[model samples]
Target: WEETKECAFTEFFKLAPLASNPALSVCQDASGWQMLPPAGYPTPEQLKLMCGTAECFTLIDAIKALNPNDCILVFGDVRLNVKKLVTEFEPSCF
Candidate 1:
């Protein structure tokens, strides 16, 4: 479960750039699953599993324990606004 949660976190980071919009949409298909971009999408059920699970909460807890203003360079030399980003994603994280 720990590894699964970690994987989900990694996936979230990888997908974060794609989630630039105020909303996101996702659909399950023959290819398995996909997130429709441009305007983002609703959180997919599978993604909810990756988020609402106990393991996911544990990950969030760990993150919340960190300094909200910590300088984490998520893209290039642009320091990530940890608090803002986390706060924005809070609802979706659950």
Candidate 2:
């Protein structure tokens, strides 16, 4: 997928899944892309995954353990907050 030369990461959100919910929408920014939400409430994994830098930090650690130069590939639409949008996913040296 990276071969396409697209952004390193992308976030595509969809509205909560329900009979009256709207379809998915996408928002792209310097940080990446943001999708609405798959559903109104977040799933267990989503709740934990969207915790911002904490999530990234853990990811960095995992990558570092594998290889000093390894890059983590996260599959999702990342939302941008006022303070942070784009971040380079460089793992800290283990």
Candidate 3:
């Protein structure tokens, strides 16, 4: 399990800003979607999913049929082991 740099399966259907409270341990932000380490919902560890390979549970059922509210079941977990989930969609906090 090397060469693991994730986030992009159409980047879970674009629009990003997960793990924020003005505290990001820094990973050089152009803010294009990835500063992940906490997806208490959809599972991330340096912007994850490829989960041991790929097609993780039908892409998590297509991230629960692509969110907008219910919003990936309001932030999923189990590591999925999601550390916190849904890492995109930022209209300045909608």
Candidate 4:
């Protein structure tokens, strides 16, 4: 539990800087709005960290709105999504 929270915190740090970039913008996908990282910017780690954090935070926000009884199930889904995000992208953004 602590490790997962720590990872999220660390991911927040990794993402916040890039999020502040003036060039950062949003784009629409089939799913909805998504941040578009500057071309030729963001190291692979930064990309993974930022993307993963975005997914986690979005879902976590939704999860928090659910009933307490759903906490465990929500957590399982969140962890699965985080794992997918962290693994799906190759660490070669730049």
Q: Write the per-residue lDDT of candidate 2 for residues 1-94, one digit (tens) a residue.
A: 1222232333221112322322112111211323333222223344344443343444333323333211222344422321112123322111
Instruction: Name the lDDT value of residue 52 in candidate 4.
Output: 48
lDDT of each: 0.37, 0.28, 0.30, 0.33
Question: TM-score per candidate, in order?
Answer: 0.34, 0.21, 0.21, 0.26
Cα displacement (angstroms), candidate 1, residue 44, comes to 5.7
lDDT digits (tens) for residues 26-75 of candidate 1: 22222122333212222465445545444444433444544344233333
User: In candidate 4, what are the lDDT values of residues 39-89, reduced to their tens digit?
Assistant: 222345455554545453443233233211211112222322233332334
lDDT of 2: 0.28
Give the Cα-based TM-score of candidate 4 against the true structure: 0.26
Backbone clash total, candidate 2: 8
- State which candidate has the highest lDDT: 1
Q: Rank the candidates by lDDT, best first.
A: 1, 4, 3, 2
**Which segments of model 4 are wrong by more than 4 Å?**
1-8, 21-24, 28-83, 89-94
The global Cα lDDT (0 to 1) of model 1 is: 0.37
Superposed on all Cα atoms, the candidates' RMSDs to the truth, in angstroms, are: 12.7, 13.5, 15.0, 12.8
- Native-referenced Cα lDDT, model 3: 0.30
Q: Candidate 2 at 15: error in angstroms?
A: 30
TM-score ranking of the models: 1, 4, 2, 3
Best by TM-score: 1
Candidates 1 and 4 compared: the better one by TM-score is: 1
lDDT per residue for candidate 3 within 4-92, as digits (tens), equals 33343444333243233232323213122232432343224423323332223333334334442322212234122121232341111
